[PDB]
Symmetry: C2
Subunit: 66 residues, 2 copies
């Protein structure tokens, strides 16, 4: 997610406002790329955190079994 | 034979090698997100550069018509 949906709704609303106002297409295209960049960065940060959690858990489990 | 095609070919080849070797799916997924992050960054840098070129050109044209 509802966070991802919140971020998407906020972004879409602002982009719709800009498009409605007739903002040059190149500026809108550029803003679409920054949004995609931010969306990719957020997913990558989460993917890394989940991989570190898995690393951290295995170390903890190993330590309890050894 | 582009420089963007070289970056894509290198990436795809390495990803395919990692998949062939049975690298955990989460690591593969993570690397796909970093690549998409890198491709978005490259398209965005170019979009910004083209917007600055347009700004710079209009200023120079205006100065000549001043």
């Amino acid at each position: 997610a509802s966070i991802e949906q919140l971020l998407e709704r906020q972004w879409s609303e602002g982009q719709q406002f800009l498009l409605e106002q007739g903002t040059p297409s190149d500026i809108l295209g550029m803003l679409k790329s920054l949004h995609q960049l931010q969306v990719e960065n957020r997913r990558l940060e989460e993917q890394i955190k989940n991989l570190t959690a898995k690393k951290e858990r295995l170390q903890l489990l190993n330590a309890q079994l050894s």
